[model samples]
Target: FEFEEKKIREIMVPRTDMVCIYESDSEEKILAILKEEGVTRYPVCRKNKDDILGFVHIRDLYNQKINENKIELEEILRDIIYISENLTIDKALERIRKEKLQLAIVVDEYGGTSGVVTIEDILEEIVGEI
Candidate 1:
């Protein structure tokens, strides 16, 4: 295990297949997977592609879609917190748990989006003895 905070890019999966949903997807579908996936939050995208619009939580999804039914997907796609690829896994953990969030888009040298990091990614980093 690392005796220190490893850079998130070092531990993060740079080639994982990330699941993203379009802003046009139905609320029922979003809710169904929210429970199944056991995730409170996810990185919202403009489409099924990799353009991350912002962050959205299941609570936000429920409060607006389930109860009020007055939310457009874009409306909840606000309040985004983004991170760069060079950050350490330890730092990412703080951001994830404290903000009740997950999923960090790894940016490339050119500042273009590269891959993604997750809470599980940080967990896996220190879950082993090195």
Candidate 2:
């Protein structure tokens, strides 16, 4: 809530706010989810052929002749950074920048997905405080 706040737990996108894409999703369904979220990368979940593994980027779909037919997220799935809820926001942002990624998964005390954080969120937090 405040720029002075250090913990990312207060800044993360609450778990309730997230919606996931699945390996079982159709081509159209996948694209639609990406479009709806308006974000390039998404954390993917698998029930049929996937895991709560890495995320997939819309850029991964570029120039591959992937028009029709079901899509496989594995080929395009990319790694994501994970952070503890209590992790300092300063350290979190630093790691994300060093990793050259824009997002992170914030985990709870029990090591469960608590929420997600983005570089955009950090800037937003700072700017909004002003």
Candidate 3:
């Protein structure tokens, strides 16, 4: 199968479906989205999809008590992976592993965010349905 040759863009969670957090989001706002979306982690963008700051895990959120409306995204944010949409899925997997990251933002030719990719997406593609 040519699954390994597939481009990251083929399996990426198109920006429209990307669940995200914002740098300026409130603690309550973050929690609300998490609960409603039922996701363990999410990317934090400065303002929108084009400006990804990083990602945050549910563990990091629970590690702190709600102190103020605005959650400290910079404090809990993890490393960011901004890769090209043209990257091969196999290469994407290798890069994700080398970076020790679970998520990556797929950037297009003009440098706009095209979508996001996760280890799960890679796994599902290689190993079949997650």
Candidate 4:
């Protein structure tokens, strides 16, 4: 459990490599991104990381009508938890459990998003594997 004391920044997915969805993006475009990125969830932003509004999970999209041709990403977005980059993995895990969230957005001192951290990432540090 020694690794649990490590800072979140050490294991987070850096913003430079993050795949995000735009607030004005159509469902068709979101679907294409999902396919291309092969990810179950993505942060929803207005224009950049600083404007991250929420997150969208593939299950939420599947729960709605994807083929309706009228659905937008905003309608399927869910609130996401935000944490500071200095947070320890142990505290992050506690937050995840309390909020029942699988991911959290990491922010810098300026309140701009720096990256994302997943439950899997924390779990890996705890148990060493899936």
CA lDDT, every prediction? Answer: 0.67, 0.74, 0.84, 0.84
Assess every candidate by TM-score: 0.63, 0.79, 0.88, 0.87
Task: Write the residue-wise lDDT of candidate 4 on 40-127 in tens digits.
Answer: 9888999888888888888777667556646566688888999999998889989898999998999998988899989988888878
Better model by TM-score, 1 or 3? 3
RMSD of each: 3.9, 3.1, 2.4, 2.2
- TM-score attained by model 4: 0.87
| Cand. 3 Cα-lDDT | 0.84
How many steric overlaps are in each model, in order?
Answer: 2, 0, 0, 0
Candidate 2 lDDT over 6-120, as tens digits, reads 7898888877786667777777777777777877767887662123687877777542326534466778888888889887776787788899988888888977788888898
- Arrange candidates by lDDT, highest first: which order? 3, 4, 2, 1
Q: Write the per-residue lDDT of candidate 1 for residues 18-64, one digit (tens) a residue.
A: 54556777767777767677666666677544577876766777898
The better candidate by TM-score, 2 or 3, is 3
Give the worst 10-residue stretch by lDDT in candidate 4. Answer: 62-71
Candidate 2 TM-score versus the reference: 0.79
Q: Which stretch of 10 consecutive residues in model 3 shows the poorest summed lDDT?
A: 63-72
List candidate 1 segments past 4 Å from native.
1-5, 13-16, 90-103, 110-112, 118-130
